[PDB]
Structure 1
Amino acid sequence: SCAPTSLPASATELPTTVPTGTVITGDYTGSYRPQVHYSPPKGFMNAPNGCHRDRNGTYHLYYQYNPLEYVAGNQHWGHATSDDLYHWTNQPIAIFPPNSTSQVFSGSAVLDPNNTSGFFPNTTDGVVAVYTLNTPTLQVQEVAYSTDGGYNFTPYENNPVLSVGSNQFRDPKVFWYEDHWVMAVAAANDFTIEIYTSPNLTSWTFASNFTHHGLLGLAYECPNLVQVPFQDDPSKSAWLMYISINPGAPLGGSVGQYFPGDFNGTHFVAYDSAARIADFAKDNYASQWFADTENGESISIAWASNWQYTQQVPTSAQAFRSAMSLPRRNYLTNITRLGWDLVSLPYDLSPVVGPSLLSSSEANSTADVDFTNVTSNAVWFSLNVTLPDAAIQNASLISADASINITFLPSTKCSSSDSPAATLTYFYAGLTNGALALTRPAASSSWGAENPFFTDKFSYTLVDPLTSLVGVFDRSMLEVFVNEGAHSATMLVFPDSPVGSMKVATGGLPEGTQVNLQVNGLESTW
């Protein structure tokens, strides 16, 4: 009746030697184990790597993987595949360190259909991985190739392909621009993204530096240079430099930021000197965009944790630490006053959407949704609010108490007290007009209350009224999307008791305000 809080030792015990060419079996039943998010069968996972789509339409996810412990280290590339970015199949480890004292750090993977590399005389489905090898004294860029569709990789003969004599030089993102390969790589502790060019992915020539932009934190990491379409006009696009920083994010630890601008194949130039943060909570880092997607599609995935507590979260008794974000569709838009904005929406959820739990059109009411019978313990919800045009043209018509309150409440059935696991509060007017508060109350979680970095409360302030809100709760994760993904937050929750229900309350809304609420159970992908 209740998901296990602890698993048998056979499920959690890690091997003392790394398995080659065999899939690692995982038990995906833990009470904190997400059912629609990727997480590794066992061990520690961080940043996504080598994200690309085959011509056969299979999505390849690789990731920083420690197969020997529940903390960072011994980095290999784990591998999982999906046709829909929700139903994941675990694959054997894809990239190994040469020995016990070296590590495979982050990188990217590209299709080389025209065999510019020379690794692929007999296939048009060749994959090239470009990644950082970490030694005690250096970080260098290395190349590996795969003829079997990205499952098994062979080291390049003349590795390494790029060194600057530094041990802070990592996370290469390779892509095709017109007539050559581009590499974005971080000179991490110099707050510089170095852009290199190559015709064959093995011989790299310096092109330009992008330095000391936006928030510095303590290091630039996981650079992504991508073309992102406009939300309102698919035919228009702009280039985006996305940079992860860790430590030293404003909320503490790790965070991503972005710069809209122009790229001409050698040089990126930001449109302005403004700093812009992607997510208004703490648990979204090291976004990578999928290479070789179908026309127009900006698809990204991120690691749904924070370096300040990722190695301490109480999920190791359930055979894992860390999960990816929902896969995201990305756009650029202009929002009122602020201008440039990175839009993030969940990638098509239809394959995991189960039956309706509640449909309601009631304004100024409270809706109670029990989902103790939803075995996934995962729900999707949508809330649309349409203010009368009177209230839109004159905001002072709105009463000070006009609000939306969403609370996730502990199960009575599966228990061990009454604190919500998660809250969302939005005010249309009053003293905190446009303020959205997202909380994981300290009282709900013994582990959370004690961890000195596990921040309880997050906020974003809208200029425009809240018109749309989409949410996914998945056992130990809440993701929310506001105003068609204009604003986005990823938040981990570790409540003592599993979530059994949610309450959605609207109050003090102007006469003629329309409210539409839909809640659906999600189907487990494991």
Structure 2
Amino acid sequence: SCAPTSLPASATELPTTVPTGTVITGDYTGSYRPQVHYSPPKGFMNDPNGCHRDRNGTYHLYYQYNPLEYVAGNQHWGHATSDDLYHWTNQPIAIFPPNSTSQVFSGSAVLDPNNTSGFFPNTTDGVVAVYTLNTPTLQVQEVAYSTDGGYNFTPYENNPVLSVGSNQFRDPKVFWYEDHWVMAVAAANDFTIEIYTSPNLTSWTFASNFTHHGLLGLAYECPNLVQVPFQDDPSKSAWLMYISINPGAPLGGSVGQYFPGDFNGTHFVAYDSAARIADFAKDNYASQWFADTENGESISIAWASNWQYTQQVPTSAQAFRSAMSLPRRNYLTNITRLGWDLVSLPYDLSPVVGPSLLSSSEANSTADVDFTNVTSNAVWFSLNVTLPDAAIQNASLISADASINITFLPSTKCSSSSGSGSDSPAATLTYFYAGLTNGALALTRPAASSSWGAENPFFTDKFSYTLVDPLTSLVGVFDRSMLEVFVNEGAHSATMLVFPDSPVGSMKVATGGLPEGTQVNLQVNGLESTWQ
């Protein structure tokens, strides 16, 4: 059969009061509902919050949650748990505002195993949440603590723990550094990340400012100050300041940027004055790193949307708005010429990988992969290309036509008669080894595939990144309404929402003009739903 395109009113109707102590029940069957990404059971989700791995290995994801509407507001912290970052268990709402005229904005969570806070005299797995409380006139930082492993939180009796008398002061990311707690918090409309320190998470002292770096956009948000291992040597690492900006991103709306540098417990110093954008498309925002991971592990997740159209995407009839990105493992590397680069790769996908749909070593060919049998409507693919040494040593031996095309094509079996009726691909990827646009990689969601997408004036159709080195590896995940691509071992990555009128039913992978002796290896797998 075919995934429903709209759900019964009982699956999409939202409560008039926020459920306390109860898990919100969700129908995850909609034709747009991602099957291996997190999305809330009902309602509207945005930024990931309080991300941490507990001592039993369970990942806790919290998130900005409107349980009452399909648009942003009434923010609570939703909560889901996973042991593998793919199979999620919805949990009751973790943090509630004190009244209907306040909202629980973004923040972070840490384990306090040594009871620095004083909240945990008889436990070693105390969790402290540090979050922004939004009121009509102020944004302040507050603490709440959990003794049950991060399910139920109690507000700190002397909240707030930090106010500067500002209405633009939010998204505290807290972490342990040697002998004290560090908070990175956004003085959002001043384009400043403020660094504060604390011995106990409740009394905070100003250390330093990081101001007017990289792209300003209209606000700094969701700062993450994290230590990231080197891809080619995970014994080595550097600090990275990751800043989300919204609005005012170059593609429009929201985007993440980063700065490699040094951190010494009080001051972050960037290695240079350059601006670096994390993702070359527009649906990757508010990346948050999981606290309490071990040495050599950098784990993050982002909200896979854009503030310019997140509240207008056509999924509310399927009981949700917004999904998280694939969970990510991060590295730092140097790429040819450009130097510093934030590597993003999908966190181990093995737990959701299903049957092989195609395995091919054919070069200069077109492989058609039908996945109308894959009930998840989600696929993974990996394409490796190894050029002959002669082509690496002399690039003038590569034909101008040497290229790769990947197209995701609409289902004939589950086609909508109401949409475009187009045979337009839902999504395309094009790369040129040489010619006039040498190294250029285009990722597109053709307007002709989506009535909604064509009409939305911010739903940009085409994205590109230009490689210096030849493309040697490409990995992708398509999950009903999302495509993520990872180029050259995660050197470059892009997160793109797609809302085709007809569900994707097949994909074509074409290579052509590749030099004599070029090795091509393609693998495609159906993914297994984590919700069904």
Which secondary structure state, in structure 2, belongs to the residue aligned with residue 390 of structure 1? helix
Superposed CA offset, 1:345-402 (max 9, x none): 0000000000100000000000000000000000000000000000001101001000
Report the CA distance between 1:80 and its aligned residue.
0.1
**CA distance in structure 2 between the partners assigned to 1:306 and 1:397 by the alignment:** 41
**CA distance in structure 2 between the partners assigned to 1:296 and 1:82 by the alignment:** 21
**CA distance in structure 2 between the partners assigned to 1:337 and 1:234 by the alignment:** 22
Partner residue in 2 for 1:265 = 265
Runs of 4+ in 1 over 2 A off after TM superposition: none
Which secondary structure state, in structure 2, belongs to the residue aligned with residue 234 of structure 1? strand
**CA distance in structure 1 between the partners assigned to 2:453 and 2:421 by the alignment:** 16
Superposed CA offset, 1:140-191 (max 9, x none): 0000000000000000000001000000000000000000000000000000
Report the CA distance between 1:294 and its aligned residue.
3.1
Report the CA distance between 1:496 and its aligned residue.
0.2
**CA distance in structure 1 between the partners assigned to 2:58 and 2:497 by the alignment:** 29
Superposed CA offset, 1:92-111 (max 9, x none): 00000000000000000000
**CA distance in structure 2 between the partners assigned to 1:97 and 1:234 by the alignment:** 41
Which secondary structure state, in structure 2, belongs to the residue aligned with residue 463 of structure 1? coil
Which secondary structure state, in structure 1, belongs to the residue aligned with residue 529 of structure 2? coil
**CA distance in structure 2 between the partners assigned to 1:182 and 1:121 by the alignment:** 22
Superposed CA offset, 1:382-441 (max 9, x none): 000000000001101001000000000000100971000000000000000000000000
Superposed CA offset, 1:248-286 (max 9, x none): 000000000000000010000000000000000000000
**CA distance in structure 2 between the partners assigned to 1:146 and 1:360 by the alignment:** 51
2:216 counterpart of 1:221: no
**CA distance in structure 2 between the partners assigned to 1:398 and 1:53 by the alignment:** 47
Which secondary structure state, in structure 2, belongs to the residue aligned with residue 391 of structure 1? helix
Which secondary structure state, in structure 1, belongs to the residue aligned with residue 131 of structure 2? strand
**CA distance in structure 1 between the partners assigned to 2:438 and 2:232 by the alignment:** 27
**CA distance in structure 1 between the partners assigned to 2:42 and 2:207 by the alignment:** 41
**CA distance in structure 2 between the partners assigned to 1:380 and 1:285 by the alignment:** 22
**CA distance in structure 2 between the partners assigned to 1:424 and 1:57 by the alignment:** 37
Report the CA distance between 1:122 and its aligned residue.
1.4
Which secondary structure state, in structure 1, belongs to the residue aligned with residue 233 of structure 2? coil
Superposed CA offset, 1:205-230 (max 9, x none): 00000000000000000000000000
Report the CA distance between 1:32 and its aligned residue.
0.1
**CA distance in structure 2 between the partners assigned to 1:263 and 1:84 by the alignment:** 30
Gaps of 5+ in 1: none
**CA distance in structure 2 between the partners assigned to 1:261 and 1:218 by the alignment:** 24
Superposed CA offset, 1:47-95 (max 9, x none): 0000000111100000000000000000000000000000000000000
**CA distance in structure 1 between the partners assigned to 2:147 and 2:442 by the alignment:** 49
Which secondary structure state, in structure 2, belongs to the residue aligned with residue 447 of structure 1? helix
Report the CA distance between 1:293 and its aligned residue.
1.1
Which secondary structure state, in structure 2, belongs to the residue aligned with residue 236 of structure 1? strand
**CA distance in structure 2 between the partners assigned to 1:14 and 1:326 by the alignment:** 26
Count of residues in correspondence between the two structures: 526
**CA distance in structure 1 between the partners assigned to 2:39 and 2:108 by the alignment:** 19
Which secondary structure state, in structure 1, belongs to the residue aligned with residue 406 of structure 2? strand
**CA distance in structure 2 between the partners assigned to 1:183 and 1:207 by the alignment:** 10
**CA distance in structure 2 between the partners assigned to 1:417 and 1:385 by the alignment:** 32
**CA distance in structure 1 between the partners assigned to 2:118 and 2:352 by the alignment:** 41
**CA distance in structure 2 between the partners assigned to 1:69 and 1:234 by the alignment:** 44
Q: TM-score, normalised by structure 2?
A: 0.98
Which secondary structure state, in structure 2, belongs to the residue aligned with residue 144 of structure 1? strand
Gaps of 5+ in 2: 415-419
Which secondary structure state, in structure 1, belongs to the residue aligned with residue 269 of structure 2? strand
In structure 1, which of residues 495, 498, 503 is the aligned counterpart of residue 500 of structure 2? 495
**CA distance in structure 2 between the partners assigned to 1:499 and 1:211 by the alignment:** 44
Q: Tell which deviates more after alignment, 50-59 or 288-297.
A: 288-297
Report the CA distance between 1:344 and its aligned residue.
0.2
**CA distance in structure 2 between the partners assigned to 1:160 and 1:365 by the alignment:** 63
Partner residue in 2 for 1:383 = 383
**CA distance in structure 2 between the partners assigned to 1:156 and 1:235 by the alignment:** 38
The alignment-based identity, stated in percent, is 100
2:516 counterpart of 1:511: yes
Superposed CA offset, 1:480-511 (max 9, x none): 00000000000000000000000000000000
Partner residue in 1 for 2:211 = 211
Q: Tell which deviates more after alignment, 289-298 or 69-78.
A: 289-298
**CA distance in structure 2 between the partners assigned to 1:114 and 1:123 by the alignment:** 9
**CA distance in structure 1 between the partners assigned to 2:6 and 2:323 by the alignment:** 18
**CA distance in structure 1 between the partners assigned to 2:478 and 2:11 by the alignment:** 25
Superposed CA offset, 1:444-502 (max 9, x none): 00000000000000000000000000000000000000000000000000000000000
Equivalent residue runs for 1:42-81 within 5 Å: 42-81=42-81
**CA distance in structure 2 between the partners assigned to 1:466 and 1:38 by the alignment:** 30
Report the CA distance between 1:295 and its aligned residue.
3.0
**CA distance in structure 2 between the partners assigned to 1:483 and 1:45 by the alignment:** 31
**CA distance in structure 2 between the partners assigned to 1:62 and 1:296 by the alignment:** 24
Report the CA distance between 1:114 and its aligned residue.
0.4
**CA distance in structure 1 between the partners assigned to 2:177 and 2:42 by the alignment:** 38
Q: TM-score, normalised by structure 1?
A: 1.00
Which secondary structure state, in structure 1, belongs to the residue aligned with residue 321 of structure 2? coil
**CA distance in structure 2 between the partners assigned to 1:416 and 1:204 by the alignment:** 59
**CA distance in structure 2 between the partners assigned to 1:347 and 1:399 by the alignment:** 36
Report the CA distance between 1:25 and its aligned residue.
0.2
Which secondary structure state, in structure 2, belongs to the residue aligned with residue 172 of structure 1? strand
Q: Tell which deviates more after alignment, 286-295 or 21-30.
A: 286-295
**CA distance in structure 2 between the partners assigned to 1:520 and 1:416 by the alignment:** 28
Report the CA distance between 1:296 and its aligned residue.
1.5
